[model samples]
Target chain A: QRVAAHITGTRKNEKALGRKINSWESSRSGHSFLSNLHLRNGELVIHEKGFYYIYSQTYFRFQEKENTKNDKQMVQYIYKYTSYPAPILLMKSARNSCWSKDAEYGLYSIYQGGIFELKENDRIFVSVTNEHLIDMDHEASFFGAFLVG
Target chain B: QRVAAHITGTRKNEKALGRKINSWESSRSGHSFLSNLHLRNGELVIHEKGFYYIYSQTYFRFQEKENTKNDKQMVQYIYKYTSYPAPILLMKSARNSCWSKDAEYGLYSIYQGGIFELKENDRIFVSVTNEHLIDMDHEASFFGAFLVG
Candidate 1:
């Protein structure tokens, strides 16, 4: 079987200072699954060395409040972690001024993916800005990868 | 051969009111191709039964036009049709108030994809709200799928 995994979004650790969006459901809901792949601490662990198509989507929304400042921008990053200390950025999507105070509420969703040659133990994870604005809707936000034969 | 395709975006139907984004460049553009897959009327037609990873990206932008009202929201939907009266939505991305009247212009990109069990003759297409706002930049907007082996 080919190596693949799909993880749904959750609100866990939304308040944490870390830029990493680390809460995901691997098999509980919303087309989430894993095959010949592993999930460790919210990161997809790849065991085989090959080309893979990795993807992610993050939805952000918030209602207007008094004295609330508008978000100037939001960014999503897919990073690869290996023995090296610095994480490699596989893909990124950034939107600027996606929301404004004139509206009662604001919404924005950042989605990105691409093919990359990854090696064994090339752990992959996703991160985003304004973590608190992340909506935990399983269908709207997700991260996954699959080996391309 | 493995069934795979990557179609870039174009503004062929920008003025058309139809929600279906029916205009796409298959080969005369960036990173676009088809291998053992067929493109008909901007929809991908499947010829084999198996699991496939479907993906799409749509970039929307508009210069602030005088006397133009801000768009309250924008949506992107991935639909599948298989001898059905109504098209089934496989995935969707919707954003509200992504732009404000205060800004000179606004931009938003919606990206979504997932693995699904599909069959022969199943056709897939993408649609979006505010069709005229779609950016024809090949790299920013695209739709494609490949069978998972």
Candidate 2:
């Protein structure tokens, strides 16, 4: 089965640092996802055991009024929470520099992908800091996974 | 079966635009590639009739001496060539401008992944504008695809 979606929007007041990115506005039909892959709350639940290709992309931008200062931190990563107590960090990316000085909107993307040996019921979800900075457009941000092998 | 490979290196004299990326260095699970998925001279030959999820990531960097000017183009994309006729573009990503000016080593990544309906004996491969800029490291740069139902 193939699961692909880009978050169109998120809850405005969600806390920062490790918020699970939910609210995918668009689901691509080119690779329509199976219903068994549950988007329960924020996680993409797994039903069978196999190797899967997991990927996530975050399109970040700064609004005009809310200019960010130097030395700030932002992050995007894929988190897997299974039956165990620990929530595993499957993949992650970070940006610490302000590349654009214009202050209008600096567009940047954090994309990470790889192969993972997953088990049955090992659920994975996307996370990011400062959800407001994320671009909600369909083509800009997305998280997806599909079984391989 | 899905085949994943990390491009360890490429030919030293491969040209700018249309060179086929070859010389995959390694794989994660040792036998990550199947015999059916042929890697004949850099192209991944598909043997079955079904939709495939093809993906690639190019890790780009700029050495100190190679600070690029404005509007310089960097391209990372996946290409498909079959026995019938001309090759088709599966997925593509591009970037312009000096995105890494003050950073140490000036590194970034262009990651693109998608699903496509492929045919028997169809071939696929990864490509980039400037092969020298791509980090052919085992982890940072890689390509793969899997059969989806």
Candidate 3:
């Protein structure tokens, strides 16, 4: 059987900086699916070893407040964790937004993806530097992978 | 035979505003390959009709200069051209960076992808709003697709 999974963003709100995004909805939308892949605590666990095209996208926005500041750096990362203690950075997207005090609002999206050789029980997850700035729109932020060969 | 292609970004700069990114290298890098797909004038011409996961990423950076302005709207688009004259938009990613004249340098990346029903000979290519700001690093910016079914 083929292995594939498409996970969408949820509002479960993981507030810690540099923490894994543990909230995802995989069945509510039509585009999300799991074909032999596993999702546990925000990590997509692989069950077979093969080549895969992994992807993730995070949408960020800034609204001008009277005294608050905007996000200087918005980053999204796709990391892979095997049996090792440290996770490997597979792909990443980073940007510094131009939202100033005079600007009413600023919007941006960070998308990153690549092909990698994965193994059985290899877990992969998505993380962001600023989780509060992430938009929970279903079509906006998503993570997915599919067996290509 | 498998239908797939992974194309890396080439620096043959297409300077015309809003023009297609007409240069890509597929054999130089270890990750780039073309199995049953065709590359012509910057488009990936498909040879089989089926479901495919098409993807693209573009990296943009800004540097402080005495006479130049930073990109306000950074966008990446994946388009599919059929036998008709008009091309249909498949996916897009847009962002507004905080890179200012005061900053020495700033970097951003836009990645977009999704699954779509493709036909034989349906050509797909990538384009950006500002080509001058694009980074030609093979790993940083790339386009690829693989048949899923």
Candidate 4:
């Protein structure tokens, strides 16, 4: 009965950084990946994983609004394969970045892709990131937060 | 998280003008026999050995409310006995006067009493009654509703 938002930002030298982040080692094959970038409140974030070609200082923001008019329409499009009722008992946002504060947020593990099960009474947590000038060659990503019922 | 209430009534002295509902059989052994009684709204409607005794109409109401509150409290207390949190997921009122909508809401058979074990999707049903009713006249007592996690 709650919604969670995850925000992410990409470095400036977009082409180089994007290539590095998307490039996975042979052993990491079949691992979950995320994309679908957007910008929200001056923050870069993404909702789900997919192929994306960077063109600029692109930012992405994934927002999950619970039991709201806009969210209803959005979820309808996202889960077109199934029908869901209002006040959904359980719903999860798409995964794009790794959770930053896994322990505090109660996200113990995200095994076998996006599948996660929480311990009783655990709440998702998020953390702030530091901004610094660099070669823009390092690829990076981070998870925002989640809401639970 | 739902609340419910119901009312039931029947005409008085409609059958066998002055005779009780179960008066015909006589047991010389003096063994305890279960008398039939029902509660309507909040009052007790009693029929013993074919004789009917309409006790204080308010008695049913008072006892019903009292017993309902007691049952709630008892369930809460039982949760404390468990090391982990175990809240009552669902509850209902059941009785001879009120037919339970489902078998899960009805009382368990006599064979299964204490230390009941439930599987992942199993249900638990419970009832409570005044000791006097069962001991004094061998009457049918409380009705229990089922709960699941």
Candidate 5:
């Protein structure tokens, strides 16, 4: 018998400092998430090469930093999708000043799409960045895509 | 057999004048949005009390009836949640004239836990009010809550 299960996951009000760091990082840089990914049937397929993407409508910001007036804070959003048994891509923000080496904080635009792969029975993860000079929490949202042929 | 199917729906964009009229009506009496409207397990559940709360964040004014000089526009962020669905709350900026019968536009205290909902399927939706409005065609973002229970 071919049994199927539907699972949903969300990360909200999660502190970005410690407990949330691992999950966030793993979603962005983990092996399975970057490997074999597929879009299921009845899923809304958003093309990566489009002029405007659905992910752009979503935003994530870092926890406000206190006492450090000069330090800048940056926020980000991530998108993970699967095509088959492997991950298709992991997209992040690429906004101006978001990638500067000297800036203490900034946000990036989520326009660029990089190749990713996934393994069988592997779960896909997505996260946002909240890198600041001081400790702060960042939050984000995600939805599952059904696998289709 | 449990089959999954994708259906598509399209709505023509209202003309500019129509949009203006709708906007005016929305500004005056407010509009209602059915929160978490979706089909589940072959059952259609319509939460009549599920509505959106709106708050004004900014306002705009025109100097003369037909005069283009000294024209002003205000922006606002309307917020609503699943808990209270009767009346929508608006948070508008004080820079512009009042839209309400009586009241000066100004900054209002942020209402925590006022703009998000998590459905049984774990889908989340959020709404907020702001002055800097992004064209619906353009990308927009806001902050909201994510509850876990």
Candidate 6:
């Protein structure tokens, strides 16, 4: 019914950036705009010239004080590997701010999304600082993109 | 093409639930979903019934000396205001935690979203705890939903 993915669950070893976010594979991958848009590993692969609005929300939480004096910087970025060997930085969090003491128990989220005019064979995915900090809860974290036009 | 909206600007005159948010009529509004969904005073009015994945990110910050003792909480809610008169709380921030002193200077974000089945004429909007604290920058804050199926 839709070409969208709200993928969740990252096996202990599968947690990290550059990996395609997984969802209900059978139902997670589908599209109506045009063929060529596929979701693989954690990247949304676009095979046609299209406009896609990609979005992702990474819910993160820190455990009990693990040194409240550590340099804390929570970052999230939307990356695309297209027409290049290395992934291109598509979107970076402007609010890439820091946290401080008592930030240990910090439970928060970083939301990133926007419209992009994509060409054929373009793959998109999300990457975070440390996958360990991301809440793997199905409803808490997810990554998805879809053809709009 | 499916309907979509990626509005970013919000004027000070708009108010809802004690915060400032944007709708289709505002300058930040875009036509991505301008037709399928109608905007009435910041509320998205639905003309076609189906499923929608609603999402919103409320970027917030607290300057120095702003009631440091307050139980800092950043709440973002997605509401569906149908003909029922009373708005339905479709989704709310499930993650609630805080930082002590630094939370004062804490520039953070509250991201919330979910899917819902709806009927024609259903109206939707986003509300936050504080409007003054939200970064009015359009790119930083937005409310949008797309039809599925």
Interface RMS for model 1: 2.4
Clash pairs detected, candidate 6: A3-A30, A20-A41, A20-A42, A20-A43, A21-A42, B4-B32, B4-B33, B8-B138
Q: Scored by Cα lDDT, where does model 3 land?
A: 0.77
Task: For residues B39-126, write the lDDT of model 2, one tens digit per residue.
Answer: 6677777788787767776766665336555444778868887664666777778865345453333455667788898888888888
Write down the lDDT of every candidate, Cα atoms only.
0.77, 0.63, 0.77, 0.20, 0.25, 0.60
In terms of TM-score, which candidate is strongest?
Answer: 1
Docking tier of model 3: it is acceptable
**What is the per-candidate TM-score for chain B?**
0.85, 0.76, 0.86, 0.17, 0.25, 0.78
A50-115: candidate 5 lDDT, tens digit per residue: 121122112233322344444333333343343444333345443322222223322221222222
Judged by whole-model lDDT over C-alpha atoms, candidate 5 comes out at 0.25
User: What tens-digit string does per-residue lDDT give for candidate 3 at B1-149?
Assistant: 45777787654222323557877884545446776898888899999999988988788876645666654687888888887677777887787756454454567787777899999999998988878888876656788898878
Interface RMSD of each: 2.4, 4.5, 2.9, 25.5, 15.1, 4.2
- Which 10 consecutive positions of candidate 4 chain B have the poorest summed lDDT? B53-62
Candidate 1 C-alpha lDDT tens digits along A10-49: 5421232228877888555535778778888888898898
**DockQ values per model:** 0.44, 0.14, 0.28, 0.02, 0.05, 0.17
Distance from true position, residue A81, model 4, in Å? 37
User: How many Å off is the CA of A100 in candidate 6?
Assistant: 6.8
Model 3 ranges off by over 4 Å: A8-19, A23-34, A61-71, A82-88, A104-117, A135-141, B9-25, B28-33, B38-53, B65-108, B113-124
Worst 10 residues of 3 chain A by lDDT: A10-19
TM-score, second chain, candidate 5: 0.25
lDDT of model 4 at residue A77? Answer: 6
lDDT of 6 by residue, A1-149 (tens): 24444555442222334333444232432321223466677577776665567877777677645544443446566777767567665544423233555333656577777655567888877776755666766566666676765
lDDT score for residue B99 of model 6? 44
Candidate 5 displacement at residue B110 in angstroms = 20
TM-score of 3: 0.66
Give the alpha carbon lDDT tens digit for every residue of B1-149 in model 4.
Answer: 11101111111212211111122113211111122323332222222222111110000111123223233111100110112234232222222311212111111101011122222222222223321212111111112111111
